[PDB]
Amino acid sequence: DLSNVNYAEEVIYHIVTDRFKDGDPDNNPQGQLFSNGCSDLTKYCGGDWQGIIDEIESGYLPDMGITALWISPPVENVFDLHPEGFSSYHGYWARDFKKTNPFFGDFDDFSRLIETAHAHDIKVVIDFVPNHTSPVDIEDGALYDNGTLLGHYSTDANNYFYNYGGSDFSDYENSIYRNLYDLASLNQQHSFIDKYLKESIQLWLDTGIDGIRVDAVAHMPLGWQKAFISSVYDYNPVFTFGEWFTGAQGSNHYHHFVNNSGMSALDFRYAQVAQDVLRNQKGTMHDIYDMLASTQLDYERPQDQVTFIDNHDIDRFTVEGRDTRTTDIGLAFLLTSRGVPAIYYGTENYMTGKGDPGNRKMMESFDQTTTAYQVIQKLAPLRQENKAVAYGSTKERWINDDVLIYERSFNGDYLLVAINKNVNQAYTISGLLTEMPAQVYHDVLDSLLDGQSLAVKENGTVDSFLLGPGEVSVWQHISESGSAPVIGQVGPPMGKPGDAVKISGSGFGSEPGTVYFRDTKIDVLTWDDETIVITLPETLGGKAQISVTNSDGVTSNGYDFQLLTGKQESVRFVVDNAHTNYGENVYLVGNVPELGNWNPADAIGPMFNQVVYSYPTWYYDVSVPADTALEFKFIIVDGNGNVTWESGGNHNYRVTSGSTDTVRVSFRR
């Protein structure tokens, strides 16, 4: 029930369904859609759900130590080729969100996949693509609803799609409302389509999926996404994260998504720096730690982000013609770092390939004897047994250009990892300090990567040792049920009053103490040392801290939580006749915390004014509580943050729920 809201202890294995294993040749496409031997990487090669099942049953997947399978969209895709030859093998060209892609299997096959994975305590995460259907030149973006045609893109009579110009090299607004490439953009703000997408995700939730990866989150309004994910949490909460492509430093909009959307993201900052330094020999370990420190600060919930060192949209981590020890090192780093690690299928067998679709070759073999496979076997389990790995912060204990020694800790549990990325040089490590208790520690990798023991003294010091070329050593300390409560994760990370939420950590004690949101006491459903289930309080919402006090009276760290006012709907706010001077933007502010609780510092915006409406009309799609008295005003804010308020009284509105809405006013000057 809340069994899927916390992935901190999971290790994800990411499969491109068509490219993993053809378990059922009979469901293979025939003719131009199919590539025999997978010689044309733009076509279907035959990988299917039976193939994944086969590799669970054989032990290949569960024996690796992975605990979750993240797979391609399971929904029916277009059956014709793009005019340039491209096929829908990847699942991102939907035609019916209520049906299976019959090339992957039927609903019975899907159920068998779910049942088989669950039988081995493996979770199943699916891609979900609410942004678009298919390339417009194939079938005019055809959308079906369990076999019933809803409509097409170019001939759209019901505003089911967005049909705006462009776009090339877009700004944020254009990135959202104009088409992604040549893909038919769904109009999520249209009540019928919003309802359809909700019915669709609910169907898949009903099949037993355990998590969702939302595609193209950089191309949909954050307000719509917040309302949508809130409805997912209402219905059947599962861990949800989005793919927002970005670079080492991320971006303003990316960070807002990570911290404010209600879901987490793929950690592209982590991935891009790992590729820079480890894969491509750009920069040094100093760049890796800069990234760790920076992201620890910038992300409200580092433990919720999904980390990776490669994926379906960047170069394979394994470089052709190079010592594969580097991939082993990359995996060790990934598995012991903060955030939920996602291993890309075939990394463990050193598959190579640059770009798309070069990075999506057919799974080569199923070799359990690679060093990489063994590395995963040794380290994946740590996340379930050691709370420092699942929830801990990160500290640098030793560093030079080639070496990083980092420590994670959580309520008395510890991890210490030493990595030397230079395969040609060894380094003498002197002056190392650690907070781990005094004792001799043995390498968790069992010297798989040339690791060694560590003797820690009472004062935290360690005798000099030689860190060999390409060496990784992993050391850990696990303590009993900690003293002092510490919260490691809260899931879902957002909710409305009455919603059940799970607080995970340790040191809570065996008997109910107290839980608070801000200064409001919360109802406890269940309580043990590592897990407390609560129901969210009816009190002023917004982003505030949840804190736990044990029965001994000791209070925990505060943990950021987003309390909603009620059931959310995506509402487009439109304001006419809002003239601004250069450098100024219009923002929306209002009574409920969804609208900033009257605080300009927390206002919604800057609003848009190019695509759906034109200046001096501005607009924005905002998640607001339904069946709630809303009062709001628009403000004009300059580059220094100076605020000028709309004159007169508040605009009042009440969203008579069950659907998206639009509310429109004229700016009072």
Task: Tell me the HSE value of 612 on the side-chain side, using a 13 A CA sphere.
Answer: 22
Phi, psi (5° rounding) for residue 213? Answer: -110, 110
Q: x-or-dash pattern for Ca ion, window 205-224, by CB under 5 A?
A: --------------xx----
The residue from 243, 304, 328, 621 that is catalytic is: 243
Structural contact between residues 607 and 618, judged by C-beta atoms closer than 8 angstroms: yes
- 533 touches Na ion (CB under 5 A): no
Nearest alpha-carbon partner for 161 in 139, 129, 193: 193
- 229 touches Na ion (CB under 5 A): no
Helices 191-206 and 222-235: crossing angle in degrees, nearest 10, is 40
| 566 annotated to bind ligand | no
| 24 annotated to bind ligand | yes
- 223 touches Na ion (CB under 5 A): yes
Residue from 9, 22, 173, 304 that binds Ca ion (CB under 5 A)?
Answer: 22
Q: Which stretch binds Na ion (CB under 5 A): 5-13, 218-226, 462-470, 548-556?
A: 218-226
Cα gap 132→483, rounded to integer Å: 50
- 144 touches Ca ion (CB under 5 A): no
- The four Cα atoms 457, 459, 464, 468 give a dihedral, to 10 degrees, of 70
Cα gap 449→471, rounded to integer Å: 5
Which residues are within 8 A (CB) of 381 and not within 5 positions of it... i.e. 6 or more apart? 65
**Complex with Ca ion: residue 158 or 662, whichever CB lies closer:** 158
| 48 annotated to bind ligand | yes
Catalytic (active site) residue 348: no
| 131 annotated to bind ligand | yes
Structural contact between residues 588 and 597, judged by C-beta atoms closer than 8 angstroms: no
Q: x-or-dash pattern for Ca ion, window 386-425, by CB under 5 A?
A: ----------------------------------------
Shortest reach from residue 222's CB to Na ion, in Å: 6
Q: x-or-dash pattern for Na ion, window 609-628, by CB under 5 A?
A: -------------xx-----
- 192 touches Ca ion (CB under 5 A): yes
The residue from 215, 267, 304, 402 that is catalytic is: 215
Residue 27 interacts with which of Ca ion, Na ion, Cl ion, none, CB < 5 to 8 Å by class: Ca ion
Size of the site for Na ion (CB under 5 A): 4
Catalytic (active site) residue 80: no
Structural contact between residues 204 and 240, judged by C-beta atoms closer than 8 angstroms: no
Residue 352 interacts with which of Cl ion, Na ion, Ca ion, none, CB < 5 to 8 Å by class: none
Q: Per-residue DSSP letters for 479-499?
A: -SS-SS-EEEEEESSEE-TT-
Cα gap 525→507, rounded to integer Å: 18
Residue whose pair of structure tokens reads 């953009």 in the numeric block: 185
Element (H, E) at 535: strand 531-535
Nearest alpha-carbon partner for 131 in 74, 192, 197, 223: 197
Nearest alpha-carbon partner for 96 in 132, 131, 146, 141: 146
Amino acid identity, position 81 = L
**Complex with Cl ion: residue 30 or 148, whichever CB lies closer:** 30
| 28 annotated to bind ligand | yes
Nearest-CB residue to Na ion?
A: 223
DSSP 439: E
Residue from 9, 48, 276, 594 that binds Ca ion (CB under 5 A)?
Answer: 48
Cα gap 434→211, rounded to integer Å: 36
Q: Which stretch binds Na ion (CB under 5 A): 34-42, 82-90, 223-231, 458-466?
A: 223-231
- 46 touches Ca ion (CB under 5 A): yes
Structural contact between residues 529 and 507, judged by C-beta atoms closer than 8 angstroms: yes
**Complex with Na ion: residue 346 or 593, whichever CB lies closer:** 593
Shortest reach from residue 575's CB to Cl ion, in Å: 12
Residue 192 interacts with which of Na ion, Cl ion, Ca ion, none, CB < 5 to 8 Å by class: Ca ion
Shortest reach from residue 559's CB to Na ion, in Å: 22
Residue whose pair of structure tokens reads 């891009």 in the numeric block: 272
Cα gap 214→244, rounded to integer Å: 9
Question: Which residues are marked as active site?
Answer: 215, 243
What residues form the annotated binding site for Ca(2+)?
22, 24, 27-28, 46, 48, 131, 176, 219
Which parts are annotated binding residues?
Answer: 22, 24, 27-28, 46, 48, 131, 176, 219
Which positions touch Ca ion (CB under 5 A)?
Answer: 22, 24, 27-28, 46, 48, 131, 139, 142, 158, 185, 192, 219-220, 427-428
